[PDB]
Symmetry: D2
Subunit: 114 residues, 4 copies
C-alpha cells in the first residue's frame, strides 16, 4: 500500500541507503512511529506496511536527506525532507511517495493508483 522512491538530482542516480521514517498522527496530535527502513540500490523502500495496518489517517514520511548528502561529502541545507498527507480509502489504493533531492532543494510527488 505504501512505497517510497528517492532520486538524486546531482549524480543522476537512485538515492541509496537513505533512512526513511513513517509516523502516524495519534489522537493526542503527536507523531507515533509507524514504519521505517533504508532505500535499496534502486532508491526504493518496499514492505513498510500492510493493507490491514495502513488505515485512514494523517501520515508523515521523513527522509534523512542530511545524512545522505554528508555521506557523499556534500553540505546540505535541509535537516530532512518531510511529506505529510492524509490516506483516504476512496477505492482500492496504492501510494507511491517520490522525492527528488538536491543539496538546497527537493521535489516530492504522490502517485496514487488502483
Amino acid at each position: 500500500p505504501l512505497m517510497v522512491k528517492v532520486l538524486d538530482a546531482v549524480r543522476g542516480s537512485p538515492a541509496i541507503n537513505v533512512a526513511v521514517h513513517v509516523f502516524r498522527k495519534a489522537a493526542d496530535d503527536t507523531w507515533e512511529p509507524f514504519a521505517s527502513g533504508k532505500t535499496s540500490e534502486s532508491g526504493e523502500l518496499h514492505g513498510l506496511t500492510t493493507e490491514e495496518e495502513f488505515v485512514e489517517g494523517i501520515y508523515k514520511v521523513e527522509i534523512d536527506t542530511k545524512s545522505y548528502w554528508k555521506a557523499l561529502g556534500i553540505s546540505p541545507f535541509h535537516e530532512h525532507a518531510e511529506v505529510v498527507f492524509t490516506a483516504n480509502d476512496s477505492g482500492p489504493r496504492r501510494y507511491t511517495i517520490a522525492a527528488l533531492l538536491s543539496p538546497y532543494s527537493y521535489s516530492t510527488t504522490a502517485v496514487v493508483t488502483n
Copy 2:
C-alpha cells in the same frame, strides 16, 4: 532576513493568501512558534522576523498548502509543505524559501545570501 515565495503550477500565478507558520526548535526539542503570515498578491511574505530575533537554530517553515487548495475548491494530497533547516550557524544570512505547488506535488528551494 527570512522571505517566503509561493507559486501555483496549475494557474501559472503567484500563490496568493497562503498561510505560513515558522517554528524554532527549543532547548526541550519541541517546536516553539516563531512567526507567521500570509503571502501577498505577488505570492511573497516579507516581514516575518528581524536580524535581532532570527538567531541560530533549527527552523521549520510550514506552508499551509491544503488550506490554499481547499480555498480554491480543490482536494489536495499533502497537509502542508514543511521546510526544516539550520539557520545563521555561521553568522547572519538572508534566506528565501521558495515553493512551487501542484495538488499532488510540490518543489521547494532555498536561496541563501551573505548580506
Copy 3:
C-alpha cells in the same frame, strides 16, 4: 538502454498515453527521428532502442505535454517538454529520463545506472 517515465503532479498518477519522440543530432546539426512511442498505464516507455543502435551522441526526448493536458480538459503553458543530453559510453550504462508534469511547470531528472 533508454527508458522514459512521465508523472502527473496534478492528479498524482502516471502520465498515461503521452506521445514521446526521441531524436538524434545528425552531422548537419538537424534532429533525425530515432525512436518514439506512447507511455503505458505505468507512465513508462520501454523498448525505444537497443544497445547496438544507442551510440554516443546528442539526443532529444520530446514529450507531447500539450496534448496530454488538453485530453484532460486542462489549459497548459508549454508546447512540449524537451530533454536534450549527450549519451556517454564511460562503462555499462542505462538511462532513465523522468519527467514530472504540471500545467505551467515540469521537472526532469536522469537516473544513469550500471
Copy 4:
C-alpha cells in the same frame, strides 16, 4: 514582458552568468533568433525584449545549463534547458521563466501576469 530567473540547487545561490537564447518560430517553421543575454549577480535576465517586439508566436527559451556547469568545473547531464510556449495569443502578457538547476536535473515554471 519577458524575464528569466535561474537558481542553483547545489550552491543555494542565484545561477550567475548563465547564457540564455530566445528563438521565435518563423512562417517557414524554423527557429529565428529573437533575443539573448546573460543572468546577472541575482540570477535574473531583464531587458530581453519590448512590448512592441514581443508579438504573438511560439517562443523557445534556451538556458545554456551545460556551459554554466562546465564553467564551474562540473560535467553535467543536459546540453541545455529548453522552454517552449505560445505567448501573447490573448493579448500582451508578462512572462517570468524560472529555472532551478542541478547537474542531472532541472525544474522550470512560468509566471504569467496580465499588465
